[PDB]
Design a protein around this ligand. Sequence first.
Ligand code: CMK
Ligand code: CMK
Lengths: 130, 128
Amino acid sequence: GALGRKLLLRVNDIMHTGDEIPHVGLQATLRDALLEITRKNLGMTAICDDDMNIIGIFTDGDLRRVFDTGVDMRDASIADVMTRGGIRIRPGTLAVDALNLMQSRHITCVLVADGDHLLGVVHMHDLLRA
Amino acid sequence: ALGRKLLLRVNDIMHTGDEIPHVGLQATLRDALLEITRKNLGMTAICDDDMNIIGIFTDGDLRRVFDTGVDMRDASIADVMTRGGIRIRPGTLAVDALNLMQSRHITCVLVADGDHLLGVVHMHDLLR
Ligand SMILES: Nc1ccn([C@@H]2O[C@H](COP(=O)(O)O[C@@]3(C(=O)O)C[C@@H](O)[C@@H](O)[C@@H]([C@H](O)CO)O3)[C@@H](O)[C@H]2O)c(=O)n1
Ligand SMILES: Nc1ccn([C@@H]2O[C@H](COP(=O)(O)O[C@@]3(C(=O)O)C[C@@H](O)[C@@H](O)[C@@H]([C@H](O)CO)O3)[C@@H](O)[C@H]2O)c(=O)n1
């Protein structure tokens, strides 16, 4: 009942915004990106330009995948290891459709955007709270 | 529909057998991450020869150890795993598994009888 009602909300009204958005710049180090991931507690970070347009994203899963090189990755830049672009939805998207997208793509956090402009982020956990 | 899927026991939806991610106590961190990738659930158990759970390791745990700045390439899983872990019984309802995952801030959970690993359920599994 409550979950069903929450899934009829627009993501605009449940997404993380402002300082709760994980994002770093294009010149960030991988360690910078990891700190941002840890602090914002969503398992991922965006990589944005100065206008808050999405350049890329990096998840905890991405770290596992890039770690599978023999070389020492500790001083890598984020620009070299990020996923370019990122899966996103419009702010009027219903939570149910965000869930369906996340299920079909096997991701747990989706960017909320107007074109390339990052407005917020929604995590699967957000769709089941409140 | 939503109400029915949420009322299933996790026994009926969990991954079992070869689909369970596990490595042994002597595995390397690289062995552990290979198993995580191969089984596609973002985590692995660490088990003894009787399939008893010693610990777990998740993609989040990799971030936490990597961000210590120590070179982790040659690490052993025994030195970086989380001992113990959160588990549920096979009769746990999907809705209760979801609430547990929410409360513990996790997206995948082991299904066990005591320490005996029976299966694993991902948040994705619960929401088909
Ligand atoms: N069945 C499980 C699953 C996980 N864990 C442990 O719970 C801690 C958190 O698990 P996580 O998967 O690493 O949790 C994260 C985290 O570690 O940051 C992942 C991250 O991508 C993001 O999803 C955040 C948000 O906090 C979600 O609320 O949550 C880890 O030490 C992990 O070993 C456990 O004991 N038993
Ligand atoms: N809004 C998003 C979110 C993620 N991604 C990209 O989609 C890929 C998958 O995201 P993930 O979070 O890394 O997905 C994982 C993965 O490793 O692919 C994480 C893992 O812990 C586990 O949750 C598995 C599922 O078990 C697979 O069903 O799913 C990554 O390259 C990520 O950059 C994206 O483009 N846009």
